[PDB]
Write a protein that binds this ligand. Structure first.
Ligand SMILES: C[S@@+](CC[C@H](N)C(=O)[O-])C[C@H]1O[C@@H](n2cnc3c(N)ncnc32)[C@H](O)[C@@H]1O
Ligand SMILES: C[S@@+](CC[C@H](N)C(=O)[O-])C[C@H]1O[C@@H](n2cnc3c(N)ncnc32)[C@H](O)[C@@H]1O
Ligand SMILES: O=C(O)C(=O)Cc1ccccc1
Ligand SMILES: O=C(O)C(=O)Cc1ccccc1
Ligand SMILES: O=C(O)[C@H](O)Cc1ccccc1
Ligand SMILES: O=C(O)[C@H](O)Cc1ccccc1
Ligand SMILES: [Ca+2]
Ligand SMILES: [Ca+2]
Ligand SMILES: [Ca+2]
Ligand SMILES: [Ca+2]
Ligand SMILES: [Ca+2]
Ligand SMILES: [Ca+2]
Ligand SMILES: [Ca+2]
Ligand SMILES: [Ca+2]
Ligand SMILES: [Ca+2]
Ligand SMILES: [Ca+2]
Ligand SMILES: [Ca+2]
Ligand SMILES: [Ca+2]
Ligand SMILES: [Ca+2]
Ligand SMILES: [Fe+3]
Ligand SMILES: [Fe+3]
Lengths: 332, 334
């Protein structure tokens, strides 16, 4: 029906603005106001946070357009999809604020002749901000379970792809007096993690170093590697692949962290067989995005292959069904 | 519970709709849409090879489109979906939203705070905007624009286009009037570059030229000698940039003075709507209003345009309604 088609396509258009707005409204404080008080006064909010009021009105109207919010007067009210969208807001942020420039440039990123050198760009600072909540909301119950089952109190912990630095911080809050080292390949991750450990008071327990975990022998921070007895790596396992490169890299890690006992690896994985009209949140963005970036994404079943060959024993495996098909491995 | 399941689907639809939206503009640009339109279907691998594209990304693009109904995948093949004809109709609007204006909306957290609203506080892609607007013009404004051209009362010899963009409006004028000289003014280098490329390639290199400038201070624009020859003036999709009202009045006068031999001035634009319920917003409107509000650019209503012309030194002779794109309009001025 021509009218159903028109309403659908309009909804597709507006969903773009709503999607971009969710992450923005989180970052700026609006989603938190609404969860707390069920409602807010748009002018008041705009003045409180010193925001351009007409743009604010738009942001909320974009949210309203798809049911996240409902406007009555100068009041914004929690809408029927508020609780779902708010729960998942870090995913929208990662898609838009974080990875938005990648998808924007689709027509320049697909042609083979452009897929050379640095042919896409994302905002590493924003990815770090999103992934900090993605960790908490989706990965944490399995991560802490694995931490509870270590068998030992760790001393020096190393985190590959540290991002916001928040994992290392939370580990230090639990094990007071541990030392932390974060390796991330991106200047914006490093910078955010440094400001964050500084603000939060751990500046002499936790350091960071810019570096590539795939070329771990070339990372500049020699000193502390051999003292590390806990290794963590979250949301970047797939950067180790294809299969050969992953095996060789896993072996380099076992060699450069001789005294690591447990290695906790958490990641999302390429799904199989999900019908197109039923893709849950995140899945399509994760898979399409990485395919655009020329970054290999293994199935869960591919991972099983590689641990023993890379010189590691897989002791425990946790399913995370809350975020596409995700997993935590406890390796030894 | 129920309901929790409905909210879950609706939010997932919003997430994937972002990907579909961005893919609509892209599949347009790379020719997947034209090909699906012609043949009703295509082979994804064959399409990747013909156009030398990274095949895994190509699968994502069609999968993104398929996630919301625009297309369906059958095996290794792609087939027209139920929302195909409509998304294809409005594809230039998505291109405008994504490929053109996407940086604006991406940076909403850094664009809204007043403390940052200084200097170059947002970025868009002027080339891409030109590309999309070329089709927006043909798809939504042409009927009314050629009605106006037909009813000029004379045959133009020199046309100036303000906010020239792709340069395609000047090209089409020249097709219709083999005599005419054309001059386009745009404030953006990406528009100029695009339009110089287009006109050379289409063979109109010696008839049409372009100059970088700000139509708001038209009076201070370099190629002034050529302006006095002009007998048709056009302006499409940037008239709001002349606002607020006070500014629009002064600019209207500078144009009158900068173009003394202009007989007609055709002015086309989209305007700010009022009272559309949030869940009943059609395509484009929200994007147009929210984006200009983020950019800090005034958007007059239709009535607001009516006041201003006489005060700006012009008289409105004919007015066309365009309900195919938000609320849009073409004015014939004199
Ligand atoms: C999505 S994030 C997750 C951040 C963090 N681990 C967390 O749980 O919040 C993945 C991070 O890994 C980093 N990264 C990606 N490839 C890498 C590599 N080869 N070496 C080091 N870091 C990498 C990225 O810069 C990004 O900060
Ligand atoms: C939306 S586009 C339309 C392009 C073209 N007129 C068409 O109809 O396809 C608007 C154009 O206005 C130009 N523009 C905006 N403000 C301007 C100004 N103050 N002076 C000159 N050009 C301007 C932009 O560079 C852009 O190319
Ligand atoms: O940004 C990336 O490149 C990621 O891989 C991000 C990610 C991966 C898995 C879960 C959530 C985010
Ligand atoms: O890109 C802009 O700033 C525009 O004003 C675009 C536009 C305006 C009116 C109709 C179509 C596009
Ligand atoms: O092979 C697997 O499925 C996991 O990679 C790790 C594991 C293996 C055996 C028993 C438990 C966990
Ligand atoms: O004032 C108006 O309504 C239009 O701006 C132009 C117009 C005026 C009178 C008759 C026709 C057209
Ligand atoms: Ca209130
Ligand atoms: Ca509603
Ligand atoms: Ca582009
Ligand atoms: Ca970026
Ligand atoms: Ca290095
Ligand atoms: Ca190495
Ligand atoms: Ca779902
Ligand atoms: Ca379908
Ligand atoms: Ca941002
Ligand atoms: Ca900027
Ligand atoms: Ca841009
Ligand atoms: Ca100028
Ligand atoms: Ca509609
Ligand atoms: Fe990744
Ligand atoms: Fe505009």
């Amino acid at each position: 029906s021509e009218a159903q088609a028109r309403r659908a396509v309009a909804d597709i258009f507006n969903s773009t603005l709503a999607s971009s707005a969710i992450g923005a409204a989180w970052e700026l404080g609006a989603l938190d106001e609404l969860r707390e008080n069920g409602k807010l006064d748009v002018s008041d909010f705009a003045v409180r946070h010193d925001l351009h009021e007409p743009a604010v009105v738009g942001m909320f109207t974009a949210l309203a357009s798809v049911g996240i919010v409902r406007r009555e007067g100068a009041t914004v009210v929690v809408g029927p999809y508020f609780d779902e969208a708010n729960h998942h807001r870090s995913l929208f942020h990662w898609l838009n604020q974080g990875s938005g420039e990648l998808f924007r440039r689709m027509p320049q990123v697909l042609p083979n002749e452009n897929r050379t050198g640095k042919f896409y760009q994302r905002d590493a600072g924003a990815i770090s901000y999103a992934c900090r909540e993605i960790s908490e909301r989706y990965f944490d119950p399995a991560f802490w379970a694995a931490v509870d089952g270590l068998g030992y109190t760790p001393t020096t912990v190393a985190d590959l792809g540290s991002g916001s630095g928040e994992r290392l911080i939370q580990i230090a809050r639990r094990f007071p007096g541990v030392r932390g080292l974060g390796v991330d390949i991106a200047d914006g991750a490093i910078a955010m993690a440094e400001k964050e450990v500084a603000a939060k008071g751990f500046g002499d327990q936790i350091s960071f170093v810019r570096g590539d975990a795939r070329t771990i022998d070339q990372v500049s921070a020699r000193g502390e590697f051999a003292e590390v007895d806990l290794l963590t790596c979250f949301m970047m396992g797939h950067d180790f692949w294809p299969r050969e490169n992953c095996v060789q890299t896993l072996r380099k890690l076992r060699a450069a962290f001789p005294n690591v006992r447990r290695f906790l690896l958490g990641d999302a994985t390429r799904t199989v067989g999900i019908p197109d009209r039923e893709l849950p949140v995140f899945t399509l963005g994760f898979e399409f995005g990485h395919d655009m970036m020329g970054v290999y994404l293994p199935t869960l079943d591919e991972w099983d292959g590689v641990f023993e060959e890379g010189g590691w024993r897989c002791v425990k495996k946790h399913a995370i069904d809350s975020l596409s098909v995700s997993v935590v491995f406890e390796l030894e």
